[PDB]
Write a protein that binds this ligand. Structure first.
Ligand SMILES: Nc1nc2c(ncn2[C@@H]2O[C@H](COP(=O)(O)OP(=O)(O)OP(=O)(O)O)[C@@H](O)[C@H]2O)c(=O)[nH]1
Ligand SMILES: [Mg+2]
Length: 412
């Protein structure tokens, strides 16, 4: 029934504090109410401390807040092997101590930031140690994969080609939200050149609320977590769909809010609104899980979608007749009291697997090579319990992820 969550890496923790905020906010549980149902991991104390100093301070147990005073290191190796190792046990312990206390759970919603040290590496083995300790569950990892041109870390790819290959054979469904492609939404669909990280977080903090929160919440067309991976992954590769939200209108500027279904659903497939720089440049969808929430008439959907199924310029895979999982919830969304999110009475958090990422992975793989081609910051990992193996052998890994996402599509 439940779904634990492990927010790993400063980012996964910032986003965590955010997604965790939106929660109580739409459940009437102020600062000090019940008890969360997740944990927080980081090898840099000062960040988890922010959850220990700032807002939502006492809504957590100093037990579900793991820290390694030591060093973060923007390098996979160190975070996965060398350092990150020391903490893992302890980490697990909570996701085994928190996993027990419950009643027939469904899985762990993992929150990490692909291209980091504590986020890429660590998790790599966290999800790793999970796939074995609970192979019998769902492993949906919600990632924030590398901005297409606006990356931060100098190494980023090293850290992301490595978190992909190690987690690939362990996740159930990996959701992806592109940090940059979300900015566009903040520039083009909300207008603000002042987007603090605290915003992107409010956003995913939204799209995510549509996943677990409301879905695990009764409705006219419930959709379990398992449901996802089933209706969402055509193949064992921990396939990565993309998150998209519909009413991303500004709560100040424009106001046409009352945008009946027929509109908000069409607003999902236009590439300028998908929290991912993977513009459907060719990527044929192969399965979409349209999660609606608020006042929505099933016919409105079983029509708004029909209209789409016949737009053709939206070309769905061949081997897939119908790939539209319609998830209907009741309670409308719940916008921050005064952030910058419109606040409509219905939304569409549609996520999907698109042959599109054939790109995004490509462009991120290429990156890697360029540097590896010169070993660049390699000495930083080797000296951290890794080898020419793990790199070269994780490169070959993704290689067959560029072929995979190619074969499962583009062909009939
Ligand atoms: N959406 C979003 N992205 C974030 C946030 N914080 C960081 N990121 C992104 O995630 C990546 C940064 O990872 P870091 O903060 O360097 O590292 P970490 O993953 O926390 O772990 P360490 O490297 O060991 O510190 C960059 O690509 C950032 O753009 C956040 O609050 N929200
Ligand atoms: Mg950090």
């Amino acid at each position: 029934r439940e779904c634990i969550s492990i927010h790993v890496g400063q980012a996964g923790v910032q986003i965590g504090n955010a997604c965790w905020e939106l929660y109580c906010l739409e459940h009437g549980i102020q600062p000090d109410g019940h008890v969360p149902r997740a944990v927080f991991v980081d090898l840099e104390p000062t960040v988890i401390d922010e959850v220990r100093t700032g807002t939502y301070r006492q809504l957590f147990h100093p037990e579900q807040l793991i820290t390694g005073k030591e060093d973060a290191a923007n390098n996979y190796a160190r975070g996965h092997y060398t350092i990150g190792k020391e903490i893992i046990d302890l980490v697990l312990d909570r996701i085994r101590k928190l996993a027990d206390q419950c009643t027939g759970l469904q899985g762990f919603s993992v929150f990490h930031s692909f291209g980091g040290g504590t986020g890429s590496g660590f998790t790599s083995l966290l999800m790793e140690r999970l796939s074995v300790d609970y192979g019998k569950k769902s492993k949906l990892e919600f990632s924030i994969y590398p901005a297409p041109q606006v990356s931060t870390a100098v190494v980023e790819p090293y850290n992301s080609i490595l978190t992909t290959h190690t987690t690939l054979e362990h996740s159930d469904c990996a959701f992806m939200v592109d940090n940059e492609a979300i900015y566009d939404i903040c520039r083009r669909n909300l207008d603000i050149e002042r987007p603090t990280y605290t915003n992107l977080n409010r956003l995913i903090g939204q799209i995510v609320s549509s996943i677990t929160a409301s879905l695990r919440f009764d409705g006219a067309l419930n959709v379990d977590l398992t449901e996802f991976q089933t209706n969402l992954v055509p193949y064992p590769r921990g396939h990565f769909p993309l998150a998209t939200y519909a009413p991303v209108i500004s709560a100040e500027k424009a106001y046409h809010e009352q945008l009946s279904v027929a509109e908000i659903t069409n607003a999902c497939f236009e590439p300028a609104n998908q929290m991912v720089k993977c513009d459907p440049r060719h990527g044929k969808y192969m399965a979409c899980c349209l999660l609606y929430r608020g006042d929505v008439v099933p016919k409105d959907v079983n029509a708004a979608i029909a209209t789409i199924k016949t737009k053709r310029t939206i070309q769905f895979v061949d081997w897939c007749p119908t790939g539209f999982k319609v998830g209907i919830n009741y309670e409308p969304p719940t916008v921050v009291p005064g952030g910058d999110l419109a606040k409509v009475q219905r939304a569409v958090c549609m996520l999907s697997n698109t042959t599109a990422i054939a790109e995004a992975w490509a462009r991120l793989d290429h990156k890697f090579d360029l540097m590896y081609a010169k070993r660049a910051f390699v000495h930083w990992y080797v000296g951290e319990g890794m080898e020419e193996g793990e790199f070269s052998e994780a490169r070959e890994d993704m290689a067959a992820l560029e072929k995979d996402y190619e074969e499962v599509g583009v062909d009939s």
